[PDB]
Symmetry: C2
Amino acid sequence: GSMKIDVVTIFPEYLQPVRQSLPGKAIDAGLVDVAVHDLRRWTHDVHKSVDDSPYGGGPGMVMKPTVWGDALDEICTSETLLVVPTPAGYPFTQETAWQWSTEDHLVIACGRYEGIDQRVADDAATRMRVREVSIGDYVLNGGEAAALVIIEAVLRLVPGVLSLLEGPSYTRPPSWRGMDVPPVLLSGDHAKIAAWRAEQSRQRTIERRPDLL
Amino acid sequence: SMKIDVVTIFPEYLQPVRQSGLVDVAVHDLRRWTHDVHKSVDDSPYGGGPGMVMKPTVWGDALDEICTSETLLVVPTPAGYPFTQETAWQWSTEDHLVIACGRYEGIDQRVADDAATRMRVREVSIGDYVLNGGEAAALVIIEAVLRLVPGVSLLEGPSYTRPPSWRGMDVPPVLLSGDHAKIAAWRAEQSRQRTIERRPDLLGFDSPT
Ligand SMILES: COc1ccc2nc(C(=O)O)sc2c1
Ligand SMILES: COc1ccc2nc(C(=O)O)sc2c1
């Protein structure tokens, strides 16, 4: 398909390598376009302020609603899927990536400090689809690394752009530092090979991810 | 003091680390440890299957030079143990992390097996989705760990700042009241509501759908 992704951030250089990692063939065929925008373009003052103190007290700072509102007004339309990475979000999974892979337009809003004033997402949700998501149970400094992960996971599911656990894999040489490749893999018995791989998958899932069982 | 070494066939993809003397980060091109003209690092899998596997020989030579017996070797993979906030706290007091980034369908299993005979090894997943390689996972792990380095339950609720009315939407009036007890209670109730709706697993309830 043809997908446009806009990313808004106070650290636009963070996103530049993924921009360049796009294959020319996909860009030239108009299959994908990733654009990155400096949030400070929409600030109101000579000091280019994007943050302010939290109502109700507490540590850190909160990103200003007036700046974010102006940025999203310009970039989003009614057809936009607005993605807001946050530790308090719904889980982003492979199922999510498959769903988003058929979208015409994703906009990813990257927070810093303690996050974005909640009225920004609440206002946007009255005229477009909004999704607050987390990429895992750890705390980052901001949304930029989450945006990188989401872009990679989604775009590899777009044609021509980019349960049990998988078991161990092997290639040449057949013997290395005293360790031989499991002989069953060189046996030419492909039903037996499939059964061996299934059992390796079972054992690894029990050991590393008992939640999946 | 922490040293982090990252090994990858795409060193350019790690440039965003430059977010910043208590920690040093270095990035290495895996292909520098090859000896042939085509600099090949991959071949077809034994036993069949799609795609290619990274050869153990080149990885062995790279890690021989970079690692010591005190190194914690980190290998991002979808088949890993989960990387969580607990993991980040644990790794925050390490002297030396080495992060090995896979491409293609992954790395020959004997690389981790051989390394484990001389150092501690951790295969980890940063979440249940598929990347094209280990590089983005390395960036996530580095950011989560470095913010906990000495000298550097429930979901968080919503945050607000000025102005107190915007586009006809009000900041919750309790937050303007100056009543610490009432503010703490409201914030606790917002967090409860959020966790039940979005992450019921954190409170010991079934996950949706
Ligand atoms: C302030 O912006 C943030 C901070 C932490 C954070 N952590 C995420 C995660 O997905 O784990 S997204 C995100 C956004
Ligand atoms: C081939 O190297 C890969 C590929 C996908 C992948 N996915 C990860 C994740 O943690 O979800 S780590 C990782 C490494």
